[PDB]
């Protein structure tokens, strides 16, 4: 395999195939699948990191959508990246406007 | 039919949105807005389905429609 | 006794913002979807997953819209959202003309 | 029975790499797979437009890098570039 | 070198519609930009449609449904009518 | 007639549209009706815009269409204004509204 | 007071010529680019396109700001109006 | 030659004219600095994208095409300079 040769856990061959079959360009180099797989693996590592953190904070062993939503929205950069994404069964962050609070 | 979206359901949605006090005309205005949104999304989804020569609108059609409208959704085979 | 007006509203805000379960009961929403679809093509079928996707997207959109509406109302020194708030919010969004 | 594909197992392997004693639900597995697909689509599309803009026919690692830097926020893009360059160099090492 | 443009065809259409009217350089450039933008949008939607149905080719059906997705009501209807009329005329001749 | 545009009774170059469709990596293969259809749609849209742009220029007693005319036309037509709702026209300006 | 405000509104809504002066804008753009990477040059048409986009964006933003100000039973635009408009726009 | 504080080259009358074309009648004092900040953010984003595209092209000059591509990236397409 090539994920092994690049220390990656994401399938390099799958990415190379999808890159050809997606009609993105006439020819596809050799580095591109490895690079794209590495970037995807890093991003999902970040997401899983923060979601597991959240699940620990909520005292759960298995990650459910709500943890993903909390990890994404609480994180500034991930929230920006998923600026136009609604996560199913995600819910919203707890946020109450000042003036609405009792005096 | 459209009235089946009950006033208290709109109240719950607003509460989850952070609203404290709601006006009477809100409920009907929300019904109109939801009608428009569903109209557009379902129009695009059908358009796709028609092009697929299927009598059964699929979740993939809905996902593609939402993507068209810049409202990407996750959890249904993205 | 009696809770002062405006407290149970905050309690419900706390309750609902902590949960992720959908807030529109499924069957009325499904019938609304089927009615709306019928006007574009006759004799149509829907995958339950498609209906759930539609419901998720619509509910999330409505919650975001209500957030923006609440911000608009607060901007006007108000605490009650009113149709003009929704209209302004959508106008600035670019949805409504 | 159709053999539909996904990213599930590699997502799980990364999850173990970062949170060994933790699991994930199917609904979240679907969300994660959708996120992978969406990011893939965005980066590949940006790279494709890169190729056309420069009148060239190949999407190389350089196109992927610049597409990543266009699409991702500052810090996340920085780390993405780090990871990508590392993996590409290590791949060119082995054969 | 050769900088291709839709200038001649835009001129033809303009004179067909407004024979006694010219177009400024900036306006011509804007019209070219609009043509290219609409081209890209329609073609991209058609390509997505081809992909979504595991299809390897874009036919006029894909263009038609892409137009129906992209353009507004009356615009889409008239554009579709024009497109299929032109397709029929091309087929016959 | 030799030109495929004449075969379809169109002013736009169906050959150029065909080349662009192929040299753009939209799909492996391109049908023969798609270039005709796309060229006809493009021609229809340009004609629709030019009509209102010439009308606007006439209103301003001008022989030539300048960007202000194109703006006025797009922003005054609901559907066109929607199609170009996220587009800016250099020197377009804004509609008079107080 | 306020008459010449309306007069200026009409005057600048009739025309299309750019409102921001050319050379200050060019200097600002050069500075900002410099901080992203040194030793950059510009095609004057690139600067002009940047200025066109900036002016269009600012005019649309001011439209939304005015809409916000009216919503607060006010007639003068204030920073919080801009903040609300940009928040609702989804900008950051 | 070093460049500094050019953001103040956006003079008050200019911002005022802009608001006038935006339909604004009465302008608060604090608006001007907020407008400068907003303009700076917008320019930073657009020129970041443009300079990225320029770097990929291995050119030392930023071209109008770069600006138009950057604007299209930001969902703010522009006609009149190519593309």
Curated annotation (Swiss-Prot), chain A:
Keywords attached to this entry: Acetylation, Chromosome, DNA-binding, Hydroxylation, Isopeptide bond, Methylation, Nucleosome core, Nucleus, Phosphoprotein, Ubl conjugation
Biological process (GO), any one: heterochromatin formation
Modifications made to the protein after synthesis: Following DNA double-strand breaks (DSBs), it is ubiquitinated through 'Lys-63' linkage of ubiquitin moieties, leading to the recruitment of repair proteins to sites of DNA damage. H2AK119Ub and ionizing radiation-induced 'Lys-63'-linked ubiquitination are distinct events.
Main location: nucleus
Keyword Cell membrane assigned: no
Cellular localisation: Nucleus; Chromosome
GO cellular component assignments: nucleosome; nucleus
Single GO term (MF): DNA binding
Entry's family note: Belongs to the histone H2A family.
Function statement: Core component of nucleosome. Nucleosomes wrap and compact DNA into chromatin, limiting DNA accessibility to the cellular machineries which require DNA as a template. Histones thereby play a central role in transcription regulation, DNA repair, DNA replication and chromosomal stability. DNA accessibility is regulated via a complex set of post-translational modifications of histones, also called histone code, and nucleosome remodeling.
Protein name from the UniProt record: Histone H2A type 1
Curated annotation (Swiss-Prot), chain B:
Residues carrying N6-succinyllysine: 7, 53, 67
Modifications after synthesis and translation: Demethylation is performed by JMJD6.
N6-(2-hydroxyisobutyryl)lysine sites (modified residues): 7, 20, 35, 53, 55, 67
Keywords: Acetylation, Chromosome, Citrullination, DNA-binding, Hydroxylation, Isopeptide bond, Methylation, Nucleosome core, Nucleus, Phosphoprotein, Ubl conjugation
GO biological process, one term: nucleosome assembly
Cellular component GO terms, alphabetical: nucleosome; nucleus
Record flagged with keyword Repeat: no
Entry-annotated residues carrying N6-butyryllysine: 7, 20, 53, 55, 67
GO MF, one annotated term: DNA binding
Principal location class: nucleus
Residue numbers carrying N6-propionyllysine: 7, 20, 53, 55, 67
Modification type N6-glutaryllysine: residues: 7, 35, 53, 55, 67
Record-annotated disulphide pairs: none
Cross-link (Glycyl lysine isopeptide (Lys-Gly) (interchain with G-Cter in UFM1)): 7
Localization, UniProt: Nucleus; Chromosome
Residues recorded with modification Phosphoserine: 23
Sites of Phosphotyrosine modification: 27, 64
Cross-link (Glycyl lysine isopeptide (Lys-Gly) (interchain with G-Cter in ubiquitin)): 67
N6-lactoyllysine found at: 7, 53, 67
Modified residues (N6-acetyllysine): 7, 35, 55, 67
Function statement: Core component of nucleosome. Nucleosomes wrap and compact DNA into chromatin, limiting DNA accessibility to the cellular machineries which require DNA as a template. Histones thereby play a central role in transcription regulation, DNA repair, DNA replication and chromosomal stability. DNA accessibility is regulated via a complex set of post-translational modifications of histones, also called histone code, and nucleosome remodeling.
Subunit structure: The nucleosome is a histone octamer containing two molecules each of H2A, H2B, H3 and H4 assembled in one H3-H4 heterotetramer and two H2A-H2B heterodimers. The octamer wraps approximately 147 bp of DNA.
Family under the similarity heading: Belongs to the histone H4 family.
Protein's recorded name: Histone H4
Organism listed in the record: Xenopus laevis (African clawed frog)
Swiss-Prot record, chain D:
Modifications the protein undergoes after translation, according to the UniProt entry: Monoubiquitination of Lys-90 by BRE1 gives a specific tag for epigenetic transcriptional activation and is also prerequisite for histone H3 'Lys-4' and 'Lys-79' methylation. GlcNAcylation at Ser-82 promotes monoubiquitination of Lys-90. It fluctuates in response to extracellular glucose, and associates with transcribed genes.
Entry keyword set: Acetylation, Chromosome, DNA-binding, Glycoprotein, Isopeptide bond, Nucleosome core, Nucleus, Phosphoprotein, Ubl conjugation
Location of cross-link Glycyl lysine isopeptide (Lys-Gly) (interchain with G-Cter in ubiquitin): 90
Keyword Phosphoprotein: yes
Compartment annotation: Nucleus; Chromosome
GO molecular-function terms, A-Z: DNA binding; protein heterodimerization activity; structural constituent of chromatin
Sugar attachment sites: 82
GO cellular component, one term: nucleus
Domain of life of the organism encoding this protein: Eukaryota
Function: Core component of nucleosome. Nucleosomes wrap and compact DNA into chromatin, limiting DNA accessibility to the cellular machineries which require DNA as a template. Histones thereby play a central role in transcription regulation, DNA repair, DNA replication and chromosomal stability. DNA accessibility is regulated via a complex set of post-translational modifications of histones, also called histone code, and nucleosome remodeling.
Quaternary structure note: The nucleosome is a histone octamer containing two molecules each of H2A, H2B, H3 and H4 assembled in one H3-H4 heterotetramer and two H2A-H2B heterodimers. The octamer wraps approximately 147 bp of DNA.
Family in the record: Belongs to the histone H2B family.
Protein name as annotated: Histone H2B 1.1
Annotated source species: Xenopus laevis
Span within the parent record: 32 to 126 of 126
């Amino acid at each position: 395999t090539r994920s092994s040769r690049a220390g990656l856990q994401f399938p390099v061959g799958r990415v190379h195939r999808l890159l050809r079959k997606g009609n993105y360009a006439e020819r596809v180099g050799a580095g591109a699948p490895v690079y794209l797989a590495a970037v995807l693996e890093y991003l999902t590592a970040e997401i899983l990191e923060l979601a597991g953190n959240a699940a620990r904070d909520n005292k759960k062993t298995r990650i459910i959508p709500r943890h993903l939503q909390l990890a994404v929205r609480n994180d500034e950069e991930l929230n920006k990246l998923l600026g136009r994404v609604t996560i199913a069964q995600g819910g919203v962050l707890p946020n109450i406007q000042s003036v609405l609070l009792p005096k | 039919n459209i009235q089946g979206i009950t006033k208290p359901a709109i109240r719950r949605l607003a509460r989850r949105g952070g609203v404290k006090r709601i006006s009477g005309l809100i409920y009907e205005e929300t019904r109109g807005v939801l009608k428009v949104f569903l109209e557009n999304v379902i129009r695009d989804a059908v358009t796709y389905t028609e092009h697929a020569k299927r009598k059964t609108v699929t979740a993939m059609d809905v996902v593609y429609a939402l993507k068209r409208q810049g409202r990407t959704l996750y959890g249904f085979g993205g | 006794h009696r809770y002062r007006p405006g407290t149970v509203a905050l309690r419900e805000i706390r309750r609902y913002q902590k949960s992720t379960e959908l807030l529109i009961r499924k069957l009325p929403f499904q019938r609304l979807v089927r009615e709306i679809a019928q006007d574009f093509k006759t004799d149509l079928r829907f995958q339950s997953s498609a209906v759930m996707a539609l419901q998720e997207a619509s509910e999330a959109y409505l919650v975001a819209l209500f957030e923006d509406t609440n911000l608009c109302a607060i901007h006007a020194k108000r605490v009650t959202i009113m149709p003009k708030d929704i209209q302004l919010a959508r106008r600035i969004r670019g949805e409504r003309a | 029975k159709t053999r539909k594909e996904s990213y599930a197992i590699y997502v799980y392997k990364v999850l173990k790499q970062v949170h060994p004693d933790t699991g994930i639900s199917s609904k979240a597995m679907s969300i994660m797979n959708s996120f992978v697909n969406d990011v893939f689509e965005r980066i590949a599309g940006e790279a494709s437009r890169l190729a056309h803009y420069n009148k060239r026919s190949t999407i190389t690692s350089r196109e992927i890098q610049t597409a990543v830097r266009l699409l991702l926020p500052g810090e996340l893009a920085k780390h993405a570039v780090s990871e990508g360059t590392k993996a590409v160099t290590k791949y060119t090492s082995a054969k």
